[PDB]
Structures are given as C-alpha cells and as structure tokens.
C-alpha cells in the first residue's frame, strides 16, 4: 500500500524555520516526485513545491527564497524546510504524491502537520474526569467524558479504551481561552449497566509537548 | 495565476437527492481540473481527475463534467457520509491552484438533544478552578440556546460553547457549554443550572445540581 507519514505537529517561533519529514512506503522516491501543499485559514489550499525523482525542485513563486526541499532515497524520506515564518504561515502542511510520476493529480496525501507560529511556549494539558452520575443518565444510557484543559498549541488527540471504543464518541473542537490556552471536552455515551463492569479511559496525547495521559473515568 | 471560483459557499440538501458543485476558472483551462473531498479532521481525497475521469475506490455516484471555464462535480444520490467540503484544482497553468471550496450539509428530521450536566471534579478543584460542563447530545438542527444560572442568578460572559461538525452517520450535532469560575466563587454558591432550548423540545429542559 502507498503511504505518506509526516512528522508531528508543533510550535515555531516567529522569524524561525519550519522542518517536516515525510516518510513514504509502497513506492520508491526514485520513481515518483513528492509534492508539498499547505492549507491555511487565510489562503486555503496552496501548492508550495515538489521534489522530482531525479532531485530537481520547483518552488511556487512566493516561496522560492525561503523554501528548500531535500530527500534521501535510500531512507525513503523527503525533507521540507521553510525560513522566516510569520504568524500567517500557521497552517496544516501536507506532503503528497501524484498518480503518475510527472503529474499533479494528488491521489495520496500525508496525514498533515499542524504548524503554529507563535511566540508563546508549549504547554501540556491537564486532564480531568467528567464523571457519569444520575444527572448524566437517561433511560439506561450514561454519558461520561474527559475535560482536556489548558494546552498550547493545537492539536491534541483523544481516543477511548486505546481505540477499542469509538461509537458514541464526540471530541469537541478546541476553544481558545482568554489565557491564550486551548480547552476541550471529549464525551461518550454508554449503557449505564456497563459502568460496574467496564473501565473507561480517555487516551490523551499532546504531541507538541510530548504529554501523554491516560485518564480513568468512574462514576462518583 | 488562474483564479478558481467555487459557488455557492454552502450547499444544503436532503439524503437521496442529486447535488452539483460549481467551479469556474478565470480563463480557459481545457479539462485540466481535479476534484477533492475533505471530511472532518481529514486530508484531501481525490474524487475525479481531468474533469470527468473516474478514480479507483471512489463510489460511482461521483461524476464530473465541463470544459473551458465552467465545471461541475455531481453526486447523483447523496448519503450521510458525503458530509464534507469539496475543492477543485486546475493544472492547465503553472502553478497549480485550488478553489476556495464548497461545504455540503445534510438535512434530516428534527431530533431533540439529550442533556447532561457535569459538576467540576475534585481533581480540578484542587487547582483552584471550577469547570461546569453541560452536554447537548445528538440533535438537529444546529441552533440551540444554553442559559446558565447559579442560585437563580443569570450567568453572562463566563461560558464557552463548542459544536461538533455534522455526524457522518446520523447527521446530528452535539454541543458542549462550559461554565468556568474560580474555586472561590464556586464554593460560595449552591445551585448550578443549565437550561436548554431547542426546536425539538416542547419545553425548555433544565439539568442542575447542588454543590455537594
């Protein structure tokens, strides 16, 4: 199977440089070019450039002087680097591959890397339980969750029972508090009859700060 | 650079209906246009290439047509998992450019929210902050009112709301309202009430608790 897997999301200080690694499998960088695209709130989807099978590069015009793309064929890695970032370079950066070696129809994309350009510091979240009670139980269905509070920057991933619990899960979009830190909740609805038998754990991972917390959520 | 204009900004349809997205180009680009789907938290997915040519693994309900400057992506019978944004891309002229996208929303029958309230955890209280969470689960449509009251006093400006994107399986929304106060303020009051108003309720629903 063809895959592009990118390095993790993170903070970059203004005026500083961005580095992303794209590791591919299921094809060889000697046969295919690898493209870079970003998606920002202001400018939407925006093609940045490409490194070709033979090592040649093209950069979209506004980035020619602050962009370098490199690779190591043997390691199946493509390296993206952009200089002197300002806050409006905050975006999701993707690496991508076309259907044919010479083309631009992007059939394979990396998972994207959220890059935030801010002067602030990275802070991991506190994780608190949202305990099921009778004030959260209707008709045999109980609601429960985790409050994921005071982190920066986006994103944070949340799963339940190590991925084994997916149905009934809602992970809310983060909101920015006045403190300049993000907060979200993640909830799930379950049978109330299972609260005595099953354990419920939110698996929280804030990659920019390397903060991993597993929070057990119990009725009070 | 070629400018691509997608219209309208938002489409709203019912399941089973046919729907069309428009992509118009600032000058002729032949049939050199590709279409993409973006679902919640996802990367773009390639739907159609060169205006009309099919892509492997893509449902037959997706087709596209057009040439010159006027292009159309169609879905002949919309399903719930088609909730997404849709983008066009031209590559007749360097550099390749994308349109700004069209959002596809799905209509469904009215569904009242299920409401739950969660007092702050003793864990959170230890840090000197109190978050009171009120959950509105699986409802349609998106419009809803949350009114917070502490000891019959209307709270204002001290809560934040977050609404999920439309659920790809049942087309509902979920909403979280979070009331945030200092531990000191929290400890000084007894009754915490979350009141919910929605088109699907024949009456406002209140969920509340007394501290301790």
């Amino acid at each position: 199977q063809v895959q592009l897997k990118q390095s993790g999301p993170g903070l970059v200080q203004p005026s500083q440089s961005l580095s992303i690694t794209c590791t591919v499998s299921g094809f060889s960088l000697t046969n295919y070019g690898v493209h870079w695209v970003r998606q920002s709130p202001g400018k939407g989807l925006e093609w940045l450039g490409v490194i070709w099978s033979g090592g040649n590069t093209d950069y979209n015009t506004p980035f020619t002087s602050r962009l370098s793309i490199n690779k190591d064929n043997s390691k199946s890695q493509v390296f993206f680097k952009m200089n002197s970032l300002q806050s409006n370079d905050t975006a999701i950066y993707y690496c991508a591959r076309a259907l044919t070696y010479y083309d631009y129809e992007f059939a394979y994309w990396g998972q994207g890397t959220l890059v935030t350009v801010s002067a602030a510091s990275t802070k991991g979240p506190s994780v608190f339980p949202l305990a099921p009670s009778s004030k959260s139980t209707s008709g045999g269905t109980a609601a429960l969750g985790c409050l994921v509070k005071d982190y920066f920057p986006e994103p944070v991933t949340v799963s339940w029972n190590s991925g084994a619990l997916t149905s009934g899960v809602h992970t809310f979009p983060a909101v920015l508090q006045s403190s300049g830190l993000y907060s979200l909740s993640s909830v799930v609805t379950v049978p109330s009859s299972s609260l005595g038998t099953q354990t419920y754990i939110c698996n929280v991972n804030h990659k920019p700060s390397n903060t991993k917390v597993d929070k057990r959520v119990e009725p009070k | 650079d070629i400018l691509l204009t997608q219209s309208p900004v938002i489409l709203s349809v019912s399941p089973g209906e046919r729907v069309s997205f428009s992509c118009r180009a600032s000058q002729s680009i032949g049939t050199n246009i590709h279409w993409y789907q973006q679902r919640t938290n996802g990367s773009p997915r390639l739907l159609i290439k060169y205006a009309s040519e099919s892509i492997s693994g893509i449902p037959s309900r997706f087709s596209g047509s057009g040439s010159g400057t006027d292009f159309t992506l169609s879905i002949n019978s919309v399903e719930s998992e088609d909730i997404a944004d849709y983008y066009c891309q031209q590559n007749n002229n360097w550099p390749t450019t994308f349109g700004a996208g069209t959002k596809l929303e799905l209509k469904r029958t009215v569904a009242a929210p299920s409401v739950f309230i969660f007092p702050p955890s003793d864990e959170q209280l230890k840090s000197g902050t109190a978050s009171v969470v009120c959950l509105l689960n699986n409802f349609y449509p998106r419009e809803a009112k949350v009114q917070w009251k502490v000891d019959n006093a209307l709270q204002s400006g001290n809560s934040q709301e977050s609404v999920t994107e439309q659920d790809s399986k049942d087309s509902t929304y979920s909403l979280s309202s979070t009331l945030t106060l200092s531990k000191a303020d929290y400890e000084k009051h007894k009754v915490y009430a979350c009141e919910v108003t929605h088109q699907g309720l024949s009456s406002p629903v209140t969920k509340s608790f007394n501290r301790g």
């Binding site: 998606q39 939407g44 905050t90 999701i92 994207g112 959220l114 | 919640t40 994107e165």
Partner: peptide, 11 residues
C-alpha cells in the same frame, strides 16, 4: 469561506 485548523472544515 474560512478554513478551520482544528477540524479541517470550512466554517
């Protein structure tokens, strides 16, 4: 049309 970095969806 405003793209949201959190959800990867248009607003």
């Amino acid at each position: 049309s405003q793209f949201d970095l959190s959800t990867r969806r248009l607003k």
